[PDB]
Design a protein around this ligand. Structure first.
Ligand SMILES: OCc1ccccc1
Ligand SMILES: [Cl-]
Ligand SMILES: [Cl-]
Ligand SMILES: [Cl-]
Ligand SMILES: [Cl-]
Ligand SMILES: [Cl-]
Ligand SMILES: [Cl-]
Ligand code: NA
Length: 129
């Protein structure tokens, strides 16, 4: 599923990400834009052989099981395919665990490079929330 900008903001807010660990909704929407272009089915292979899955490009190196990432963990206790569903519940619950792990949203390199310190509120502007 490819979400609309305000549609995703709404879904993210409903699932508890607005101001989760102090990150306003705009941060999460900005992150999703540059990670996946709002596409739940996005997948991208990493140099180390791991793969990133879904709207927030969650990595199989630590967070989910895809059966093909040697020496990895599955800390969210989910198959990576669950991260590609039109329903973002699994992605959100997993992102909550990740953002809580010590480094905040810096875990998402695209957030650090493209969203961090920017006017992220613009990503939720005009949205019925
Ligand atoms: O796209 C980077 C990333 C992968 C896995 C968890 C958080 C961030
Ligand atoms: Cl957009
Ligand atoms: Cl915001
Ligand atoms: Cl293994
Ligand atoms: Cl599994
Ligand atoms: Cl949803
Ligand atoms: Cl933080
Ligand atoms: Na594996």
């Amino acid at each position: 599923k490819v979400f609309g900008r305000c549609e995703l903001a709404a879904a993210m807010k409903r699932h508890g990400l607005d101001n989760y660990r102090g990150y306003s909704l705009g941060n999460w929407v900005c992150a999703a834009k540059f990670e996946s272009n709002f596409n739940t089915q996005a997948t991208n292979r990493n140099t180390d052989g791991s793969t990133d899955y879904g709207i927030l490009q969650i990595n199989s190196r630590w967070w989910c099981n895809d059966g093909r990432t040697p020496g990895s963990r599955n800390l969210c206790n989910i198959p990576c395919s669950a991260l590609l569903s039109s329903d973002i519940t699994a992605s959100v619950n997993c992102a909550k665990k990740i953002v809580s792990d010590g480094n905040g949203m810096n875990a998402w390199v695209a957030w650090r490079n493209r969203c961090k310190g920017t006017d992220v509120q613009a990503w939720i502007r005009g949205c019925r929330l």
